[PDB]
C-alpha cells in the first residue's frame, strides 16, 4: 500500500489513421501534485505536434486539500480507477483516450490508448504550430460514488498567435466507492500547468496540479 | 467613475410566458461584491427564481492588477455589451442580452432573458433548484474588442442530483481593451452567489474574484 | 381563419455589436412549402455577409405529408407559436434569434430579433466569403404537446472551398397543444433548400421545404 | 468484390465492466440491408442491448449513382477506419473504433466500444430503451481521405421520453475517395434498425439509404 514515487508509460494509438507508439518513465511528488516524464518513440519521429499529447502524458500524484485524492486512495488500496476521455477540437478534430494502470508498491505502470482523427493536414497539429498548452481549470463532479465527471475548456498557443481551443470531458470510473471526505466536497476544481520540451522522437514533460474548492 | 450603485430592469419569457422585474442594489468594485433586491411587476414568477442567478454586473469585478476591462469601459464611457447562451442538460436553453447605461457611479442595466424547452416536470418549472454551485469561468480574448467566456455551471436540487448547464458568452467592447490586459491570458473568475426568494421578490448577492493562478510563487523559505 | 399567401418582415438586431435593420415583403405557397422574400436595409450597407441571415429569412408555408404542419394549424386557429433559436458557429461565433408573428387573414407579419457576436473580423462572415447555404435536414421532436425541439447541422460553402459549419437548435413554443396525429409521427425531418441574391443594401431570398418521416417507403 | 457476408467481434467495457460478443451476418449491398446474429462470449450483458445498435457495416451501403466510398474501399481492398463518439443527454459517453479486413465477399469487423458515465438508475443500465429512432446522418468530406458524419440520435423508452445523443465520427480512408463521390455534398443517409434479444443471443437488422435530395 503506497502513494506513488515513480511511473512508467506505454502510450499508443493513431492520429489520422497512422499509428504511433512511445514508452518512458518518470517520477513525481504526491504531496505536491508534481510529475516529470521522459518518453521515446518506438516507431520513428512523431508525425504530429507533440503538444497534442500533453493531456495524455497521472492523478495518483494529485493530493486533495485535506488528504488523499480519490485517485490516490484507489492506488493506495489497489482497487484502482480507469479514465475515459474525449477531446473535441475547434477545427473538427477529435481524440478519444483510455487510461489503464497497474501498481507495484510506489510504482505505477500506465497503458494508454489515444486515437485522434480529423486533424486537418494544414492545421496547427499536423503542421507543428502549437507552442504551449495554456494553464487550465478542470471542474469535477461526482454523479455517483464510483464516477467522476471532469470538464475543462482547453487551449494551446500557436505560432500564428491565435489560440487552438478544445473541449475536454472524461469519466473516471472507480472499482470501489470513493470515500465520504471526497464525495461531499463538490464541485472540486483542479488548476494545472504543463511544460514540454521535445525532439522529433523524445519528449520531456512536466505537470503541476493543485486541487481547490475556493480561491477567496 | 467606478460603480457604487446599480438598478436593473430584467424582462423576457420562460416557456413563452412573459416575466418582468425591477430591482436596485449596491456593490464594491474594489472587492467584487454586489447585492440586489428585485420585485416582479407582473405577479408571481412561474419558474424557479434560481434560474435567474447569472442574469442578476462585471463593473463590480476588479482584475488582479487593476481595473477589469469591464470597469475600464464603464470608466471611459465606451462600454460593452453581453450576449450569453445557456444550454441545460435536459434540453432547455436560455439566451440573454445585457445592455448598460451609466450616470456617474450609477449603473442601469436592461437585460432581455428568453428561456425555452424547460420540461414542465423538470427542476426549473417545479422549483426544485436549491442553490447555484460556486463556479469558475474561463476568459480568452480572441480579438482586442471581444471576450469569450465559458463556464460549466451546476445547481443543487432537492433530489440530491445536480442540474448542469454550459454557459457561453461574448462581451463586445466598443473600443479595444488595453494592451496590458490582452497580454495576460487565460483569465479565470471564481464566483459565489446567494439567493433568497419568494414568488414575487428576491434578494441576490454575488462575490467574484479574478485569478490567473492558484499556485504560490515558491520563493518562500 | 386562413393559411398564408403573403408575408412581411421586420428583422433587426446586431452583429458584433453593430446594429442592423431590414424590412420587406414576400409571398409563398402553403401547399408546396415554397416562399420568396425581398428585403432592404433601412440603415445603409450591411457590414456582414448577407448569407448569415438565411435561416432568419416562415414555417406557416410548410405542409405535412397528409395535412397541416403544427405551424400551419396554429396560424389557422390564431393560437400561434413562438421561435427561440440558437446557432453556434465553428469559429466561436454565436447567433440567437427570437421570431414572433401576427396574422391578418392570409398575411403574416414577422418581427425577428437576431443578435450575433464573436464573428472574427477576418472570418468568412465579416469578410463576405460565404457563397451558398448547403441543403439541410432538420430533425424535429416533440418533448411535450406544446413544444418542438428542432436540431440541424448546417454549413455554408465559402470562396476558400472549405465549409463554414454551425449547429442550429430551436424550440418552437405553442399556445395550444399540437394535434394527436402530429404528435404520433416522430421524428419528423424537414429537407430545405435556399437561394439568396444580394447587394450591400438589398436581397432576394427563396426557400423550399419538405417534411418527411421516411425515404424508404 | 462487394460484400455478401460479415462477422463481428465487438469488445470493450460499459461503466468499467468488460463485454465481448461474436457473431455473423449477411447483407445486400445493392439495397443497403444487413442482418446479424450475436452472442456474448462471457455471460448476459449487464446493460440495455439497444445501446449497441450503432456498433452493430457501410460496405452494404450503395450510393444513388454507384458504390459508396465505403464499398469502393472494400472493392479495391484499401479500406477505411471509423472513429466515433457518442455523447448522451444524461452525461454518458461512448467511444468506438472500427477496423475491417476482407476475404472475397466476406467482411471481418473488429470493433472496440467503450462506454462510461451511464447512471446506474438510467435507461441503459435498467433496460428501459425500447427502440432506436430512425435517423438521418449528414456526411461532409473535409479532405479527400476523410468523411465527417453527424447525427442527432434518439431511442424511445418505456415511459415515452426519448433518450437523446449526439453521434459524431470520422471515417479515414487509406486512398482518396472517387472524385464523383467528393462532388456531391452534403450526402445524407437515412437509417432504420431492428433489434431483438434473448438472454442467449441478439438479432439485428439495418436498412440504410443515401440521398442528396428528397424533393
Coordinates of C-alpha atoms in Angstrom, one line a residue, chain B residues 29-217:
Chain B
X29 CA -15.9 47.5 -7.3
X30 CA -12.6 47.0 -5.3
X31 CA -13.8 43.7 -3.8
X32 CA -16.0 42.1 -6.5
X33 CA -19.1 42.1 -4.2
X34 CA -22.7 43.1 -5.1
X35 CA -26.2 42.9 -3.7
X36 CA -29.6 43.4 -5.5
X37 CA -33.2 43.3 -4.5
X38 CA -35.9 42.8 -7.1
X39 CA -39.7 42.7 -7.3
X40 CA -41.9 41.3 -10.1
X41 CA -44.0 43.8 -11.9
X42 CA -46.4 41.1 -13.2
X43 CA -47.3 38.8 -10.3
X44 CA -45.6 35.6 -9.0
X45 CA -42.8 34.1 -11.1
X46 CA -43.9 30.8 -12.7
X47 CA -40.3 29.2 -12.6
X48 CA -37.5 28.7 -10.1
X49 CA -36.0 32.1 -9.3
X50 CA -32.6 30.3 -9.2
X51 CA -32.7 30.1 -13.0
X52 CA -32.2 33.9 -12.9
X53 CA -28.9 33.9 -11.0
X54 CA -26.4 34.6 -13.8
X55 CA -28.7 37.3 -15.1
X56 CA -28.8 39.1 -11.8
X57 CA -22.6 43.4 -13.3
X58 CA -18.9 42.9 -14.1
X59 CA -18.4 46.6 -13.5
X60 CA -18.0 45.4 -9.9
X61 CA -15.2 42.9 -10.8
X62 CA -11.7 44.3 -10.4
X63 CA -8.9 42.4 -12.2
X64 CA -5.9 41.1 -10.2
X65 CA -3.7 44.2 -11.1
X66 CA -6.1 47.0 -11.9
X67 CA -9.5 47.7 -13.5
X68 CA -11.1 44.8 -15.3
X69 CA -11.8 45.6 -19.0
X70 CA -15.5 45.9 -17.9
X71 CA -14.6 48.6 -15.4
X72 CA -12.3 50.4 -17.9
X73 CA -15.1 50.5 -20.5
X74 CA -17.6 52.0 -18.0
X75 CA -14.9 54.4 -16.7
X76 CA -14.2 55.9 -20.2
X77 CA -17.9 55.6 -21.3
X78 CA -17.1 53.4 -24.3
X79 CA -19.0 50.5 -22.8
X80 CA -19.5 46.8 -23.6
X81 CA -22.5 44.5 -24.3
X82 CA -23.0 40.9 -23.2
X83 CA -24.5 38.2 -25.3
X84 CA -24.9 34.9 -23.4
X85 CA -26.3 31.5 -24.1
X86 CA -27.0 28.7 -21.6
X87 CA -27.8 25.1 -22.6
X88 CA -29.2 22.9 -19.9
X89 CA -28.7 19.1 -19.6
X90 CA -32.5 18.5 -20.0
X91 CA -32.6 20.3 -23.3
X92 CA -33.7 23.7 -22.2
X93 CA -32.0 26.9 -23.4
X94 CA -31.7 30.5 -22.4
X95 CA -30.4 33.4 -24.4
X96 CA -29.7 36.8 -22.8
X97 CA -28.6 40.2 -23.9
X98 CA -27.2 42.8 -21.3
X99 CA -27.0 46.5 -22.1
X100 CA -26.0 49.2 -19.7
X101 CA -26.1 53.0 -19.3
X102 CA -24.1 54.9 -16.8
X103 CA -24.8 58.0 -14.8
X104 CA -21.6 58.8 -12.8
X105 CA -21.1 55.9 -10.4
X106 CA -24.7 54.6 -11.0
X107 CA -25.3 51.6 -13.5
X108 CA -28.6 51.0 -15.2
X109 CA -29.0 47.5 -16.7
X110 CA -31.6 46.5 -19.2
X111 CA -31.5 42.7 -19.7
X112 CA -33.6 40.6 -22.0
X113 CA -33.7 36.9 -20.9
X114 CA -35.5 34.3 -23.0
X115 CA -35.8 30.6 -21.9
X116 CA -37.5 27.8 -23.7
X117 CA -37.8 24.0 -23.5
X118 CA -37.8 23.7 -19.7
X119 CA -39.7 20.4 -19.1
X120 CA -42.9 21.1 -17.2
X121 CA -41.9 18.3 -14.8
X122 CA -38.2 19.4 -14.5
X123 CA -36.5 21.2 -11.6
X124 CA -36.9 24.7 -13.0
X125 CA -40.7 24.7 -13.6
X126 CA -41.3 22.6 -10.3
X127 CA -39.0 24.8 -8.2
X128 CA -36.5 22.0 -7.2
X129 CA -33.3 24.1 -7.5
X130 CA -31.7 24.8 -4.1
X131 CA -28.5 26.7 -4.8
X132 CA -26.1 27.6 -7.6
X133 CA -22.8 25.9 -7.2
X134 CA -19.6 28.0 -7.0
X135 CA -18.1 28.4 -10.4
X136 CA -15.0 29.1 -12.4
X137 CA -15.3 30.9 -15.7
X138 CA -12.5 30.9 -18.3
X139 CA -12.0 34.1 -20.4
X140 CA -10.0 34.4 -23.6
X141 CA -9.6 37.5 -25.9
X142 CA -9.9 36.3 -29.5
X143 CA -9.5 39.9 -30.6
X144 CA -8.9 43.2 -29.0
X145 CA -12.7 44.1 -28.7
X146 CA -14.1 40.6 -27.8
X147 CA -14.0 38.4 -24.7
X148 CA -15.2 34.8 -25.0
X149 CA -16.2 33.4 -21.5
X150 CA -17.1 29.8 -20.8
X151 CA -18.3 28.0 -17.7
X152 CA -19.7 24.6 -16.8
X153 CA -22.4 25.5 -14.3
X154 CA -24.5 23.4 -11.9
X155 CA -27.3 23.8 -9.3
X156 CA -28.0 21.5 -6.4
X157 CA -31.6 20.3 -6.3
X158 CA -33.9 18.8 -3.6
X159 CA -33.5 15.4 -5.3
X160 CA -29.7 15.4 -4.4
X161 CA -28.8 15.5 -8.1
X162 CA -27.0 18.4 -9.8
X163 CA -28.7 20.2 -12.7
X164 CA -25.9 21.1 -15.1
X165 CA -25.6 23.6 -17.9
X166 CA -23.0 25.1 -20.3
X167 CA -22.8 28.8 -20.3
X168 CA -21.1 30.7 -23.1
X169 CA -20.9 34.5 -23.8
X170 CA -19.2 37.1 -25.8
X171 CA -18.5 40.5 -24.2
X172 CA -18.3 43.0 -27.1
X173 CA -16.4 46.2 -26.5
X174 CA -16.9 49.5 -28.5
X175 CA -13.2 50.3 -28.0
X176 CA -10.1 48.0 -27.8
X177 CA -9.2 46.6 -24.4
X178 CA -5.9 47.9 -23.0
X179 CA -2.8 46.2 -24.3
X180 CA -1.7 45.2 -20.8
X181 CA -5.0 43.3 -20.2
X182 CA -4.7 41.5 -23.5
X183 CA -1.2 40.3 -22.7
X184 CA -2.3 38.0 -19.8
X185 CA -4.5 35.0 -20.8
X186 CA -6.3 33.0 -19.9
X187 CA -8.1 34.9 -17.1
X188 CA -10.3 32.9 -14.7
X189 CA -13.1 34.2 -12.4
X190 CA -14.3 32.4 -9.3
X191 CA -17.9 33.2 -8.3
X192 CA -20.2 32.6 -5.4
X193 CA -23.8 33.5 -5.3
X194 CA -26.6 33.5 -2.8
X195 CA -30.4 34.0 -3.5
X196 CA -33.3 34.4 -1.1
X197 CA -36.7 34.4 -2.7
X198 CA -40.5 34.5 -2.6
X199 CA -42.8 34.1 -5.5
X200 CA -42.6 37.9 -6.3
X201 CA -39.3 39.2 -4.6
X202 CA -35.8 38.2 -4.3
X203 CA -32.5 39.2 -2.7
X204 CA -29.3 38.4 -4.6
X205 CA -25.7 38.5 -3.6
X206 CA -22.6 37.7 -5.6
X207 CA -18.9 37.6 -4.9
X208 CA -16.4 37.4 -7.7
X209 CA -12.7 37.1 -7.8
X210 CA -10.4 37.1 -10.9
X211 CA -7.3 34.9 -10.9
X212 CA -4.6 33.8 -13.3
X213 CA -3.0 31.2 -10.9
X214 CA -3.7 29.4 -7.6
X215 CA -0.2 28.3 -7.0
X216 CA 2.4 30.0 -4.8
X217 CA 5.4 31.8 -6.3

